[PDB]
Amino acid sequence: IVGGTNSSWGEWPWQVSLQVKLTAQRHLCGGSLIGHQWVLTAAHCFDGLPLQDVWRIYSGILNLSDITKDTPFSQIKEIIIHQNYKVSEGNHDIALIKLQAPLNYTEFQKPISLPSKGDTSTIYTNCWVTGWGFSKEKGEIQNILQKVNIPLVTNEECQKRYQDYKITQRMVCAGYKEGGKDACKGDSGGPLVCKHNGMWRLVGITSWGEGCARREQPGVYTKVAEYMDWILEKTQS
C-alpha cells in the first residue's frame, strides 16, 4: 500500500496473508475470508504455484513480523480458479480457496460481507484497500497491515489511462488523479472494501495497475459483484 497508514486490531478481520513455504517462507498475496472455510483472492496469486502443498494462510494477524513457528495457519484443500482466467489481459482474475479445516470466528478473524449481484450499479463513496505490499515502487513488504482510503473511478476514466488494455464491466478502478495513494506489489488478491450504513462490503479484489500511485494511473480491481453467481455456485455445499 502506498500513502497508507498502520491498521489497528479488528479494523480488517477478514484480511488474510497467503504465504509460500519452499526453502524459506514469504508473504506473496492477500485475500479475504468470506466463510468459515473459504478465502477469496486473485487468480494471478497461483500463477506459478498452483499446487496446494506450499501454501500457508495466516488469519487473525496484524503484523507479519509477529509470525513465529508456533503461529497457527490454515492449509489449502482446494484452489478454484475462474475457468476463463487469462494471465496476459487479467480478465476473470479471481480465485477461491477452500481451507482444510473451518476457522472459528473472532473479532480478529471473521468474514467480510459480499455484495449483491445487483450491486454492479451501486455507488460506494467510502472505500479502502489493505495489505502488506510495497509502500512505494521498488519498495519492500510492510510488517503492519496498511490501509488507504481511495475513490472509485468510472470505467470511462480508467479506460483512458490504459489504452494498451481493455477495462471491462467486470473490473472496477480506484485512484487519485494526482496519485500518491494506491495498492502495490504484494497487495495482490487483497480486498477493496466500502463502508455503508456501518457495514463493510467487499467490492473489489486487487488485480493490476501500472506502477504504484502514479498520477493518472488508477489501480484495477476485480469487481466482485460481477462474479457473485460464480462464487455462490463454487461455494455451494
Binding site: 506459478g48 494471465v87 513488504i141 494498451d164 495498492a183 506489489k185 501500472e210
Partner: peptide, 10 residues
C-alpha cells in the same frame, strides 16, 4: 510476467 502485474516476483 503480465506488464502491470502486482505479483511480487514480477
Amino acid at each position: 510476467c503480465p506488464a502491470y502485474s502486482x505479483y511480487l516476483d514480477c
